[PDB]
Amino acid sequence: EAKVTIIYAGLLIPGDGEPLRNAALVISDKIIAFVGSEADIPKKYLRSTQSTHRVPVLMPGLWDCHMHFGGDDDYYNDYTSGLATHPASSGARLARGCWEALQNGYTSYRDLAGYGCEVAKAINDGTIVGPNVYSSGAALSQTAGHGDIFALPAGEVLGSYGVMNPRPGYWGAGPLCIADGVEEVRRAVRLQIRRGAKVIKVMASGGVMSRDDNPNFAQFSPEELKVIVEEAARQNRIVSAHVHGKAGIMAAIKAGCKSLEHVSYADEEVWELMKEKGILYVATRSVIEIFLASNGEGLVKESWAKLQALADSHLKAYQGAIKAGVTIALGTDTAPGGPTALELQFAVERGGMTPLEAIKAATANAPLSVGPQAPLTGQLREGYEADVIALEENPLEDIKVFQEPKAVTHVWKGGKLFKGPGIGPWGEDARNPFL
Amino acid sequence: DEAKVTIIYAGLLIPGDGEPLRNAALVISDKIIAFVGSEADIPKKYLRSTQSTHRVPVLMPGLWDCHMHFGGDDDYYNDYTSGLATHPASSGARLARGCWEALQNGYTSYRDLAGYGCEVAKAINDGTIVGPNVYSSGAALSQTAGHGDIFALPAGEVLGSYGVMNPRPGYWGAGPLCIADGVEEVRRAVRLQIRRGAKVIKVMASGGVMSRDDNPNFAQFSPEELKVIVEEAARQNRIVSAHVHGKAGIMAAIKAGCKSLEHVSYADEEVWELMKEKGILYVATRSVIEIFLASNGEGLVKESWAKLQALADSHLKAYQGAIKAGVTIALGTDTAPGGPTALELQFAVERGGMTPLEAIKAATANAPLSVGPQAPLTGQLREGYEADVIALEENPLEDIKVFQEPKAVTHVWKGGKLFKGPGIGPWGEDARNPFL
Amino acid sequence: EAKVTIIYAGLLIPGDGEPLRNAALVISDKIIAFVGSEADIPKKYLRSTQSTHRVPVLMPGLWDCHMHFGGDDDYYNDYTSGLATHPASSGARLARGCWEALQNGYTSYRDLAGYGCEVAKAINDGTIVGPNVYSSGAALSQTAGHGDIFALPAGEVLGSYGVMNPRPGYWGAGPLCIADGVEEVRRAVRLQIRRGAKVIKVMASGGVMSRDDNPNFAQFSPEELKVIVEEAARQNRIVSAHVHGKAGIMAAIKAGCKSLEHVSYADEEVWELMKEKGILYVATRSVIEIFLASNGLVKESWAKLQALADSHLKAYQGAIKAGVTIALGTDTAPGGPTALELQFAVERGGMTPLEAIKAATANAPLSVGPQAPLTGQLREGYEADVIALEENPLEDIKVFQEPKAVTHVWKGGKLFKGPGIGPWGEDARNPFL
Amino acid sequence: AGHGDIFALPAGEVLGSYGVMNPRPGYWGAGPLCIADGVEEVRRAVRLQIRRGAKVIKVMASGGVMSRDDNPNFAQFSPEELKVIVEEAARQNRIVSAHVHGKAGIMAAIKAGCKSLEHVSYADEEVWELMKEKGILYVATRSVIE
DSSP: OOOEEEEEEEEEOOSSSOOEEEEEEEEETTEEEEEEEGGGOOHHHHHHOSEEEEEEEEEEOEEEEEEOOOOOOSSOSSTHHHHHSOHHHHHHHHHHHHHHHHHTTEEEEEEOSSSHHHHHHHHHTTSSOOOEEEEOOSEEEOTTSTTSOTTSOHHHHHHHHBSSSOOTTTTTOSSEEEOOSHHHHHHHHHHHHHHTOSSEEEEOBOOSSOSSSOTTSBOSOHHHHHHHHHHHHHTTOOEEEEEOSHHHHHHHHHHTOOEEEEOTTOOHHHHHHHHHHTOEEEOOHHHHHHHHHHTSSSSOHHHHHHHHHHHHHHHHHHHHHHHHTOOEEOOOOBOTTSSTHHHHHHHHHTTOOOHHHHHHHHTTSGGGGGGGGOOSOSSOOTTSBOOEEEESSOTTTOGGGGGOGGGEEEEEETTEEEESTTOOTTOTTOOOTTO | OOOOEEEEEEEEEOOSSSOOEEEEEEEEETTEEEEEEEGGGOOHHHHHHOSEEEEEEEEEEOEEEEEEOOOOOOSSOSSTHHHHHSOHHHHHHHHHHHHHHHHHTTEEEEEEOSSSHHHHHHHHHTTSSOOOEEEEOOSEEEOTTSTTSOTTSOHHHHHHHHBSSSOOTTTTTOSSEEEOOSHHHHHHHHHHHHHHTOSSEEEEOBOOTTOSSSOTTSBOSOHHHHHHHHHHHHHTTOOEEEEEOSHHHHHHHHHHTOOEEEEOTTOOHHHHHHHHHHTOEEEOOHHHHHHHHHHTSSSSOHHHHHHHHHHHHHHHHHHHHHHHHTOOEEOOOOBOTTSSTHHHHHHHHHTTOOOHHHHHHHHTTSGGGGGGGGOOSOSSOOTTSBOOEEEESSOTTTOGGGGGOGGGEEEEEETTEEEESTTOOTTOTTOOOTTO | OOOEEEEEEEEEOOSSSOOEEEEEEEEETTEEEEEEEGGGOOHHHHHHOSEEEEEEEEEEOEEEEEEOOOOOOSSOSSTHHHHHSOHHHHHHHHHHHHHHHHHTTEEEEEEOSSSHHHHHHHHHTTSSOOOEEEEOOSEEEOTTSTTSOTTSOHHHHHHHHBSSSOOTTTTTOSSEEEOOSHHHHHHHHHHHHHHTOSSEEEEOBOOSSOSSSOTTSBOSOHHHHHHHHHHHHHTTOOEEEEEOSHHHHHHHHHHTOOEEEEOTTOOHHHHHHHHHHTOEEEOOHHHHHHHHHHOOOOHHHHHHHHHHHHHHHHHHHHHHHHTOOEEOOOOBOTTSSTHHHHHHIIIIIOOOHHHHHHHHTTSGGGGGGGGOOSOSSOOTTSBOOEEEESSOTTTOGGGGGOGGGEEEEEETTEEEESTTOOTTOTTOOOTTO | OOTTSOTTSOHHHHHHHHBSSSOOTTTTTOSSOOBOOSHHHHHHHHHHHHHHTOSSEEEEOBOOSSOSSSOTTSBOSOHHHHHHHHHHHHHTTOOEEEEEOSHHHHHHHHHHTOOEEEEOTTOOHHHHHHHHHHTOEEEOOHHHHO
């Protein structure tokens, strides 16, 4: 017999479309069986329902499309810590982060550098809890690219992350992958798919800080990028590209990347291209706002001016893409359980989205971030996956409501209740997996 | 700011080593126990200053298990291949659940004897997750063709992963097992575990219980290697724990200076006296034998099943004999974190012949002996000792099986901090999201 | 609150353009705020100036566009020393050389093989002093190219300098890089950028000595050269090519190299190509003059060297007459006899002393393409790399060969040599306290 | 796991750089630190410094002054290794200098034949007489504590 749950909602926000007043939603097992007004609930569900809930606001589970599953020790302040941190330490930390994500109403995460694949195995076998994780495995970078650890010598970095010299020690399974040339890059992509990656991530321009590589300059050759995209496509993955400057943006687009990150120097030409080819825009404004709040605290005056210049372009680019009708999704660029809700605030207060459009970007649009790997999800619609959250207050009146996890009262993932009144930390019917 | 003072009134207080007290009270000041005795004798200064008070039926020290393995393995391979094949990020995530579950059951200290205890301890100590105090061995040390080897894989794959030659990228020297042959290599083997933060050293000193590949009746490592291993551990104030079944292994481990023995299946009168004389801890791990006894030799050949039963009987005699002879004993299960550790207390009583009170002594007061000089003053409800304290609904002295229901453990303190109790969230009192 | 310096000059040589008599220059912080005649100094600077100087001759800081930061031990006489010398020994030596360079009025160096990137970190953090260093990192060579150490076996050389087999021991950070094939050469370029290289250097023909490889034959395939140039261009670097014979010269040009070194067999066809495409000519005549002054070689090998020396002279003179853009380079260690190259520009090339100075100042930043700031000229808005002289070099170009004649040296507006100024520059502190 | 080890990096990276096994290109055996375990390895460790022209040999004979990773109170190296180290230095007319804090380290270094001690933080009456008796130099390095 099927497990039926009825949820009555004062306000129901479907994800893409006008909200409904005095609505109801039916869950049958893993899927959403009915959505519409309370009066029109099909009678068969009224007869069979195992339980009913009554909440002020109901909506789809939230996505963040730019996470990194690092779980780093707090010893080194740069990417050295990705290398130096033992992955067992990382996985333990990510377990807390995944718990915290789900308690905040985030039911799907796109991991773009780290151990998402490996940690997903502990979610999927029931040992821990968390969002659906769609991981890139390692971010792919060139030597001297944004993925390289410039402070370490090169042999140490490529010994750890290169695709030559197979060896013991979990070779080809770190947060970063360095490959140079068409030959190496084929293996780079395949090594992530091997881990179970459901997306591919490349560094296609320099890092936002201008110290080693330059954000204005492209990374990888067009030849390498095209192969990377072809390799991903053959297994039904799309590629996501880290891009700031227009050189990087255009090279990534030409190659066939279907998701761009940051996109700091996107202009009219870029917005039209992205619309034309169905390329997703993930701004990660949180990352810029963090360093803006620092005020150039330890930085040299000219480097701080450079960061502000980039911050202004990034704002124009984001606002322009929103005005131009480019398809947008929300991503924070943080660890699991990080301040992802802020990105919704920035979508409204910086981007100029309505609260309703901001929610569309974190729900209905978000599965586009993994292309053909997405199930029917991110919307409260019949036949879609039952990833549903309930709120105490109406986020359309204050988008900051998501920044208080107590305001998220109920969390369903695949029809299963992971947070709610009377529900323990590890979800309904949780048992000790080691007993 | 103030010292944090907590007063706990207990209908029955079980100190760990000594007669229980009725209508007692315990005072916590910050991380240590400030007072223990009868309710009437609480020093007045604490009555004035206390931040909070609790009232529980039964109070006792936090429980130790002295034989855990922090593996966190994927379920794919059924032998030790999974230790090698499982990515440690998968392992750590699993061990995080297990550590939570341990603490909810009243286990405030664990001795990890093969695995990622050191690496997972960093996530406990920085507040990211919660768990027991973890005293880890890092990797178990084994010889080539020892109980730590993965016989089903070819040798170059195993020693490439776990050997102490050929340094390389990929977290070299930081797995669940370490293979070393010869005095030179075993020095590095010990040092590599200390490097990770190991607070104990574990060696395979005889074959595995199953007897498919190596033989439990035969000793492992040379006496020369064992002595060096013990010297290396001693120089950094660690003791060595030895996996031993047959008497050859037991005697070699004893001669070398090992201070804790595991399983000890063929211990006899001679062994019990030696262990008493030299202050060597006996950790029986009866749970491991009971598991395969409950199977009835289902997947096994008739002669191999008979051999397992013979070993099971010796192990029982050895355990009972050691208890009768007054050898110092501690409890260990040989399971993953959050495993069925409470059963070992049942077996201490129902198999070993301990009183429920002696069984509790073995899981509390005696247990820090399992890590030698690395132990703080803990495992007892005594003034000056660490405030690892648990509260129960029911009296375990009347039914030792009470520990098998985690709901019966109502309050858990670790270093004076409340990790379980009425109104306390899953990650302990005053828990914050560490990622904000 | 800006730091303002006024310098009055009896003669001011801007670098590109007619010199001015009785001029003045204003420095504000790191840049040049004003250049023109003494009478026209904007009054705001007269009010605010922290100090004033009065010198006979003022000009931009000098560039040398062909240096090698080797710092080799004196033990081996060939490239074995690059391999055998411990880099700590090298860096110590280069520190002296960088000091000496700055005392001679050389405020920018282009390093084309060695540890320029690594030594630049000690200049930029204030620990030592020296010119602005624009380094190539390692010179890129093919196996059996001019960068190979033929006297050592091949496994030793490629173990040290190859781009396969990452390992401990500062892999990918030596004075030479050996790469074969399009795949390897991509990494070769990236490995230099990783170190902070602001230019890329390739061996595109054999060495001037004809013993192992031949100067008349090209090196690397056109396929590899094109990729090398593309890889450099993507990070806004240009490629400099070591070239002697015409085969090498033409291959380097075709690929997109923007600077050529030696250029010994350049003819009419080459000069027009270099003009058309904006390719810089760095002759390094000093290198030829050294071996000419020697006359141990076999008779036929000495004739071959003389033949090459004559072609090199014709090529240089022809390029000057044809109006190819030229810059000066010596091919020596830091603190080496770089000033001699100016002498050879005049006495061998046929440049006027003014044109020779243009080649060592105004034209020289072209040697690093888009990595150059506005520098090499005494002009408003340009970087304050300025030197002062006791005597007029337009009357005797050999004046630069006496470092005592260089009385004041400014780099980024900071005084590193001048009356009352200590060895480590103005306001120098012991960095280790 | 001694005071010369870089605990924050994984062990393969450190011993790849500073160990005395696996000779390779890249100025092997010529860094600021040398990691060696066992009598066999320590012989080469000493010889590798002499090779560079070393006019003294330095050992870590106890933990670092900070008590984070290793412990200053505990000795480092075995007496067996220390004795060989001293014999190897002596054969080329070098003495050994020992980094020592705790008395365990101080005594082991003295017993082995070290002729210079550094820091010497837990030196007491017994130590002072020993150092006088055997002609062992005391280098306090008080600046580091200050």
